[PDB]
From a paper:
The Microrchidia (MORC) family of chromatin-remodelling ATPases is pivotal in forming higher-order chromatin structures that suppress transcription. All MORCs share three features: an N-terminal gyrase, heat shock protein 90, histidine kinase and MutL (GHKL) ATPase domain, a central CW-type zinc finger (CW) domain, and a divergent C-terminal domain (CTD) with predicted coiled coils (CCs). MORC2 possesses multiple DNA-binding sites that undergo structural rearrangement upon DNA binding. Importantly, MORC2 mediates chromatin remodelling via ATP hydrolysis-dependent DNA compaction in vitro, regulated by the phosphorylation state of its CTD.
Residue numbers in the entry:
A (entry chain A): 5 to 290, 365 to 514, 519 to 551
B (entry chain B): 1 to 290, 365 to 510, 519 to 528, 534 to 551
């Protein structure tokens, strides 16, 4: 019996400490997006409710239709390190039992989480404002639960429930049980979770770091856009478009669907490479698919995109010839999905915990990328002439090519444009040319007579496998 | 300032797996080690000894021991160690590196499965035992941490609960490298002064091949990363001796690795034609309502070891960061080492203290540094000489850039005439410049220990 022994405890300042892991704020947001995906949500809505009385002038809301959380799961949310997703063969991104807390405390001072399950709706309130105002060094988290049908309290302690609800009304954007019930009603199905981050972090100028004004359809970083800054790093729409290698959950930003894209599908001459990783085999004792392709659309947006369990960890990583001053292998996008048995993510899921094995994987990627360069033989065809074939005659490299319809279609018909249905969530390849943000497309709108119906099996692209060496 | 009682409300809690979660912040293992080195420095230690005690029965084959002569810890501070986020150092105008109340735990759990910390203060000897082995063996999901205290003089237990003390000591004897109170007191006696702390990380993480990540065999004087060092690998990233040599911009604590002193070096003190630059940051001015010194110089000794070294509160956060012309294709500003000490009011470190929490303001600082580095290049005006000719004057006549310069005594002395070799006394910790060593050196071996530390004030350049 170890009841009398000391326990490691969380202090209020540890919320900020944990939040410090996210120097990439879109990574903090991706924590909540990953949680929604793990919850089997078919849909996550990322929108802002204007609130001029709250720091930043608006709340950041993550509404998903996933499995939600019963009171036990909601309580486990504040068990740092607790992750039921940490399971063998798990396809769930979450493993560290930390992402929600770290990301939410990076995004804003306070977050209030509304979750609904079979017949229970639970509110989880993490208010650093409450802690600072009332001088609390622990991390006290109200966790009231109502019956999702009767809306009556579900508690073994009416005193505790009253204190929790009064704290919510005092320190949250919602001053009454009626406003709280409105938030719950925003969860339309039998299950789902709404995470509202409010009192958002301000920059030096007093403006919120998240800019939702420049583009009402996007969550942007409040900061200038250098010529080399990447859309996935300045635009959360662009980030969420590639956040997952297997996009199944629909992402909506300010009510506008994010056009998720598989980076492999948008490349010229893709060649998959089966790398028999000694790391993977050693931890099996206890293969990887490198997909390389030329980004004719944006030769600037080249680099390795390393996913870990379908979730983007590294983006625009330069490997192999991309590291040298010569542009050889320039414009090539590499994508690899690394399972947990090969690599684990860092604390913020923006890097890999095992630096040595990540370096080994990057070296393997560089070797296979050089092999891909030799295989496609566009150097044998002439690299600059190949680029000119798609309108890249500008002396500069990064900025896009001449957008005249000639080269536009030359690139388009070399890129099989795929789309996802808004109802069955399956991905289809279209035989025509799209006109333009995404639509509410469904399988019924596919002119392809072979797959024009909803029940049609997903015709899966099979990248032509290449052999290393 | 609470309106009511919150005893019944749920508290966020640490689970056993959160130890690993926290440890995952350190993809850089030497950063995990630097957490303990920073703690020793914050404890005002004059020296920290980083040595390996061979233990074939423990995973990795040896224990990693951090022995410092700092202020140590009374039982209250030792208890506060496991209060995640608790940092008494997090105070206004604090020179102490620690602010997040996390470094020890994150770094120790990154380095090894278990760590046992022995700390001594006025008359108390406290042991803090963080044993993930114990938790795994006994199915503990919380983080239970034994924290027995002995009277440093009588060696008697200091506890308000003899049952708790007995359980803590039995857990230590069962799951730690030290199976008896005699061995525990032997560890305590390794703290020779009235105060100090000994942190022993054991059951070290193994690589895939079953070897420990920390290689203490290739170089018995160094703690190395167990891995091949490609041409571009940096010594500070593969050698912990090299890392600790530059871990702090103000080296005052002596660092010994395997009993061998680390020759700490101020990167700004060994550059050719250094020019400090006064940069005023609106963030600094604001949070003062609540200047930065960019030092640029040419690394003639190793022009390949060039880049910005960003220190935060005297502690290295970013190393070899490329800014300004260093990012383009060409050797303009090549070989330039830039050093800046950013106070906490200007930037805060990330969770692992290997990056800066405010990415936007870090980018602003890097842009300012690049502008000032271009200014430095125009100021020294190597066009007077030509970049290649200037490099050749110091032995860089090889067509390649990365490879070191000529070892001929001519060029060696040519370089030495530009970099006044500075030395730190082993008795008073003061730094002296000699006109013209591994074991030790004092002011008498030049001057005396009572002489004021002459400061090498860099010339001041002008930006625009
Ligand atoms: N949107 C959500 N829907 C359902 N359950 C959720 C949601 N967000 C969080 N949870 C639950 O709360 C737990 C804690 O979240 P989090 O702190 O992100 O840990 P994790 O997701 O398990 N692991 P990681 O994200 O790698 O730290 C999750 O593991 C889920 O059980
Ligand atoms: N070697 C040491 N000597 C004395 N006190 C120490 C030592 N190591 C740790 N401590 C104490 O234990 C506390 C917790 O250590 P740590 O987890 O490193 O947090 P911190 O050093 O306060 N801040 P950070 O390193 O930024 O997380 C310190 O703040 C000190 O009070
Ligand atoms: Mg998560
Ligand atoms: Mg510390
Ligand atoms: Zn369909
Ligand atoms: Zn002296």
């Amino acid at each position: 019996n170890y009841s009398s022994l000391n326990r490691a405890q969380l202090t209020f300042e540890y919320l900020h400490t944990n939040s410090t892991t996210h120097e990439f704020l879109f990574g903090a947001l991706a924590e909540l997006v990953d949680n929604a995906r793990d919850a089997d949500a078919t849909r996550i809505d990322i929108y802002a409710e204007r609130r001029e009385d709250l720091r930043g002038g608006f709340m950041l809301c993550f509404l998903d239709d996933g499995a939600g959380m019963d009171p036990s799961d909601a309580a486990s949310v504040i068990q740092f390190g607790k992750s039921a997703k940490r399971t063998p063969e798990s396809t769930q991104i979450g493993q560290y039992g930390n992402g929600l807390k770290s990301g939410s405390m990076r995004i804003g001072k306070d977050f209030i989480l509304f979750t609904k399950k079979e017949d229970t709706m639970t509110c989880l309130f993490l208010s650093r404002t409450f802690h600072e105002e009332e001088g609390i060094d622990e991390v006290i988290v109200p966790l009231p639960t109502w019956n999702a049908r009767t809306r009556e309290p579900v508690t073994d302690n009416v005193e505790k429930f009253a204190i929790e609800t009064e704290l919510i009304y005092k320190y949250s954007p919602f001053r009454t049980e009626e406003e709280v019930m409105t938030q719950f009603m925003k969860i339309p199905g039998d299950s789902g979770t709404l995470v509202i981050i409010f009192n958002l972090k301000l920059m030096d100028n007093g403006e919120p770091e998240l800019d939702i004004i420049s583009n009402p359809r996007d969550i942007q970083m409040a900061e200038t856009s250098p010529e080399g800054t990447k859309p996935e790093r300045r635009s959360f729409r662009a980030y969420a478009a590639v956040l997952y290698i297997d996009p199944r959950m629909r992402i909506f930003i300010h009510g506008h669907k994010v056009q998720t894209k598989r980076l492999s599908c948008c490349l010229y001459k893709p060649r998959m490479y089966k790398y028999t990783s000694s790391r993977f085999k050693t931890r099996a004792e206890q293969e990887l698919n490198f997909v390389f392709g030329v980004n004719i659309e944006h030769r600037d947006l080249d680099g390795m995109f390393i996913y870990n369990c379908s979730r983007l960890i590294k983006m625009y990583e330069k490997v192999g010839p991309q590291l040298e001053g010569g542009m050889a292998c320039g414009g090539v996008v590499g994508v690899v999905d690394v399972p947990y048995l090969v690599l684990e993510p860092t604390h913020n899921k923006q890097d890999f915990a095992d630096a040595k094995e990540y370096r080994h994987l990057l070296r393997a990627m560089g070797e296979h990328l050089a092999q891909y360069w030799k295989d496609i033989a566009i150097a044998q065809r002439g690299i600059i002439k190949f680029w000119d074939e798609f309108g890249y005659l500008s002396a500069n490299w990064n900025q896009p090519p001449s957008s005249e319809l000639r080269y536009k279609r030359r690139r388009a018909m070399e890129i099989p444009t795929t789309i996802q249905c808004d109802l069955c969530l399956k991905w289809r390849t279209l035989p025509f040319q799209l006109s333009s943000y995404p639509d509410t497309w469904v399988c019924s709108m596919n002119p392809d007579p072979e797959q024009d119906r909803c029940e049609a099996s997903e015709q899966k692209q099979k990248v032509p496998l290449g052999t290393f060496r």
